[PDB]
C-alpha cells in the first residue's frame, strides 16, 4: 500500500521549483558554499513539519481538507483567515509563478544570451493559464491521464538530467565542487540573505501541505507512522542536492545566476540536440504542475463550499459533467491580475513567507491543543521534542527575516488582517434579510448556464 | 441557502441560452487565438540581438610580463622551481596570462656557444619546467615563453649572417609547442632584416599548429606609419610598441593619438601597453598611475603590464638599483642591503589591506575585466570635448553600458558634455551611478547629474548605467 501513497506524495512534492529557485538561492547565498546546505536544511524542516502533520492526520479524523483542523481547533476565526489567505495569496500567485516560468523557459530557446520582451512572456503565460483552465474544465474523463502524461515527461526530463550529471562527474569533474573552487565569495556571507535564499528552497519544497488528504482517505494507517515521511523526505532532498551538484559541475558559478534561466543553458553548453528535447519536457512538467495545483485548489473550493463560508454560491454542478465552473473563473481572475502586474522572485519570497506563516499558525495551534488535551485517542507514537524544535526554529525564521523588506511583509499582513472586518461583519450581520441577500440566488443563471 | 433546484435549472435552460453559451465559448477561444497571434507577431518582429564573437583566451583578462625570475623572487630564492609558490598570489590578481624571461643558454654574443634547445641549469631544469606548466594548467594561467638570441649583450639579435640564427629558432618553435607552452614573445623587432616576412612565417607556423596560440611582437618604434608597415599583412598579430610613451600629458593629445591609431588599424584587436618591457612608474610622473591604470585597463584590447606594476614600484627612487631588472618586493625583508628604506605603503601586504591603494585598484578593475562583457568585446566611440579631457563610452548591443572620464590637466574641469554623435541605440542618459574613482571622495552607487562634474586635477571617474532600450 505504500507504493501508491509514495507515488502521489512525490507527485505532489516535485514541481517546477527546482528551476527558478537555484539561481536565486545562489544570488542570496553569497557563494557556491552553503547552497547545498540550504537545500538539505529545507528538506529537514519539511520532514519535521510532515511528521507533525502526519500525527495530526492519524489523530481525530475530521475531513474537509486543510482548513478543517484549524477551524475546529483554536476557533473558526483562524480557519476563515487561513482559508482566505489560501484562496487569495497562496494558490493564485503560485499558479501565476508556474505559468510565468513556463513562458520564461519557452521563450529562452530563441534568445540564448538575450532578454526577451516582457509583453511576449506575459501574453504566453496568460494563454497557457487559460488553456489549462479550459483543460481542467469540461473533459474531466481524460484530464487525469493528460496530467499523468505531463508528469511522465517530468520524470523523463529529471532522469535525463540525472544521467548526464552522473556520467559527467566521472570525467574527473571536481570543478566547481571542491572548496578550492567552491569557496569564492563574490558577495560577503550574510545571514539575512541566507534566509532569503532559504525562502527559495522553501518554495521548491512546496506541496507537503497536500499530503493530508489521501493519507487518511485510503487504507487505514494501523499505526503506520514512519512510511509516509521516511519514504518521501530523504530521497527527494538527496535528488535535489544532487541535481544542484549536477548543475554546478557543468557550469561556472557566474553563468548560473547571470541569466533568467537555469536550464536550457544546461542543454546548450553540452550535448546539442538534447538541448532541443529538454525545454519541451520542462514545459510538460510545468503543465502538469499547474494542472495539479488546479485540481487541489478545486478540492479546496469544494471543501470550503461545504462549510458555508467563502460565499456558498460557488462550485456547484452545471448540467452533466459535475465540473466546478464558477470556481475556475474566480481562479483565473486572481492570476490575471498578477499577469497584469507582477514579477518573479519578489512573488517567490511572498509565497514562501505566507505559506510558512500558515504552517507556523497550524503548528502553534496543534501545540496549544496538545497542551490543552488530556483526552481522546492518538494512534501515533508521541514525539514531544520535534514539534517544539520546529516551533522555535520557525519563530526564529519569522523574527529574523522580518528585516528584509517591509514592502512585501507589510502588505501581506495587511491583507491577512483585512479578513477580520468582513469576517465579523458577516457572522454578526448577515441575518438581516436585505434585498441584496434575498436576491443573491437570482444570479445562479445570470452567471453561468 | 441559494441552492437552486436541478429541475428548475434544467427547465430554465433554453436552446437560446445554449446558443449564447456557444457564442461565449467561441469568443473565448477567439480571444485565446488572438493572444497566440499577438505573441507570434511580437516574437517574430522582435529585434534580433547579435551573437558572441567566440573570443580566445587572451582576449579576456590582462597579461603579466616577467623579465627576470631572479629579480622577481630575490637572492637565494631566485630559482625557477620557486615559481609555483607565487601562483596563488598571481591568480588573485585576476590576470589570465604570464610571460617568462629568456631561460636558454647564451653567454655573450656567441652563436656557436648558444643553442636554443637546452635550458641553463642556473634557473631550473626540464622536470621543473614540466611541473610549472602542470601547476599552471591546474590553475587557469597560461604560460608564454620568449626567445631572444641575446638577453645580455647590446647586440640583441645576432648581427651576423641570418639563416644560421633563423633555423635554430625555427625548429625551437615546434620544439616548444610540443613541450606544451603556448604563445611567444619577440622583442627588438627593429634589429632585424626582412622582419615582416619572418614574422609572417612565424605566425603562419603557429596558426598552422593551432588557434589558441599567439605571438607577441615588441618594437620600440613610435610611428604610426612604421607600425602600419609592420602590420601590413599580419593583421591577427598582437604587438606591443612604444606608441603611448610620448610625453603627452593632455587629454586632447591623448584623444588624438588613440583615435588616430584606432582609425589607422580599423577596428581590429590590439594591445595597449605604454612601454616595450619597462614599468609604468619609471616612464611616467608618479601622480598619474591612479588614472593610467583605468585608462589601460578599459581600452579595447589586451593590456600588458610589466611585473611589479600593481604597486607602482620605482627603480629611480631607490639608490643602487639597475633600471633593467628591478627587484620585486613582498615585505620589509626584501631589501637587506639598505634597511629602513622600504615601508608599508608600497609592500604587497600593506597595499592589499588598504582599499585606497594601487593593488586594491588593480584588483577592482581586474575583477571587472574578466567577468563583464561590455568592456570585454564592446564598441568604442568618443565625444568631441573641449579642453584636455578624456571621454568615451563602451557598450555592447544589449548589455549594460560603461562610461569613463579622465582629467590630465592641473586645474579643475567642467562636465564637458557632448551628445548627438551616437546612434539612438547608443544613447546616454543623464543619471549614472559612480562605480570607482582614483581618489576616494565620492560615494559608490550614488547617481549624479551629468552636467555638474567638478573634476579635481589628476583624477578619473568610472561611471556605470543599466542599459536603456
Ligand atoms: C488577488 C490580489 C491580486 C493583487 C494583490 O493582492 C491579491 O497581489 C498582491 C501581491 O502581488 C503584491 C505585490 C507583491 C510583491 C511586491 C514587491 C515590491 O518590491 C519592492 O519594491 C520596493 C519599492 O522601492 C523596493 O524596490 C526597489 O527599491 C529601491 C529603493 O527604493 C528602488 O531604487 C527600486 O527602483 C528602481 O529605481 C531605479 C530604476 O532604474 C529601477 O528600474 C528601479 O527598480 C525599487 O525597485 C522597483 O522600483 C519600481 C519603480 O520605482 C517599483 O517601485 C517596484 O515596485 C512596484 O511597487 C508597486 C506597489 O504596489 C507595484 O504596484 C508595482 O508593480 C511594482 O513594480 C520596485 O520593486 C524593494 O526592494 C522591492 O522588494 C513591490 O514594491 C510591491 C509588490 C509588487 C506587491 C504590490 C501589491 C501586490 C500586487 C498585492 C495586491 C493587493
Ligand atoms: C629605438 O631604439 C634605438 C636603439 O636604442 C634608438 O636609437 C636608434 O638606433 C638605430 C640602430 O639601428 C639607429 O640606426 C642607425 O642608422 C645609421 C644609418 O647610417 C647607422 O649607421 C647606425 O649604425 C645605426 O644603425 C638610429 O639612428 C637610432 N636613433 C633613432 C632616432 O632611430 C631609437 O631612437 C629608438 N626609437 C625609435 C623610434 O627607433
Ligand atoms: C581613417 O583613415 C581613413 C583612411 O586614411 C580615412 O577615412 C576616410 O577619409 C576620407 C577623407 O580622406 C573620408 O571621405 C571618408 O569618409 C573616411 N572614411 C572613414 C570610414 O572614416 C581617414 O584618414 C580616417 N577617418 C577619419 C574619420 O578621420
Ligand atoms: C610612504 O611611507 C614612507 C614612510 O617612511 C613615507 O616617508 C615619509 O617621508 C616624509 C617626507 O619628508 C618624512 O618627513 C617622513 O618622516 C617619512 N615617514 C613617515 C612615516 O611619514 C612616505 O611619504 C609615504 N608615501 C607617501 C606617498 O606618503
Ligand atoms: C600558411 O601558409 C600556407 C602556404 O602554403 C597556406 O597554405 C596556409 O593557408 C597558411 N596558413 C594560414 C592559417 O593562412
Author numbering:
A (entry chain A): 41 to 489
B (entry chain B): 61 to 529
Provide passages from the article that reported this PDB entry.
The amino acid transporter Asc1/CD98hc (SLC7A10/SLC3A2) is a non-stereoselective small neutral amino acid exchanger (e.g., glycine and, L- and D-serine, alanine, cysteine, and threonine)1–4 expressed mainly in the brain and adipose tissue. Asc1/CD98hc belongs to the family of Heteromeric Amino acid Transporters (HATs), which are composed of a transporter (SLC7; L-amino acid transporter; LAT) and an ancillary (SLC3) subunit linked by a disulfide bridge. Interestingly, Asc1/CD98hc is the only HAT for neutral amino acids that is not an obligatory exchanger, and it also mediates the release of intracellular substrates by facilitated diffusion. Asc1/CD98hc is also the only member of the HAT family that efficiently transports glycine, and D- and L-enantiomers of the amino acid serine, and this particular substrate selectivity underlies the physiological functions of this transporter in both the central nervous system and adipose tissue.
We determined the structure of the human Asc1/CD98hc heterodimer in the absence of substrate in an inward-open conformation with a partial occlusion of TM1a, as described in detail below. We further classified the dataset by using iterative 3D reconstructions and classifications to yield a subset of particles that were refined to high resolution by removing the contribution of noise from the micelle using non-uniform refinement. The estimated average resolution for the cryoEM map of Asc1/CD98hc was ~ 4 Å, with local resolutions as good as 3.4–3.8 Å for most of the map, except for some flexible cytoplasmic regions, thereby allowing the modeling of the Asc1/CD98hc heterodimer structure. The structure of the heterodimer was confidently modeled for residues 41–489 for Asc1 and 61–529 for CD98hc, thus excluding the flexible N-terminal ends of both proteins. Asc1 is covalently bound to CD98hc via a disulfide bridge involving residues Cys 154 (Asc1) and Cys 109 (CD98hc), with additional contacts between CD98hc TM’ helix and the surrounding TM helices of Asc1. The four N-glycosylation sites of CD98hc (residues 264, 280, 323, and 405) were also modeled. Finally, density for a digitonin molecule was observed near TM helices 3, 9, 10, and 12, as previously reported for human LAT221. The substrate binding site of the human Asc1 transporter is in an inward-facing partially occluded conformation, with TM1a tilted to limit the access of substrates to the binding site from the cytosolic side of the membrane. The semi-occlusion of Asc1 is the result of a partial tilting of TM1a to an intermediate position between the fully open cytosolic gate of human LAT221 and the fully occluded cytosolic gate of human LAT125.
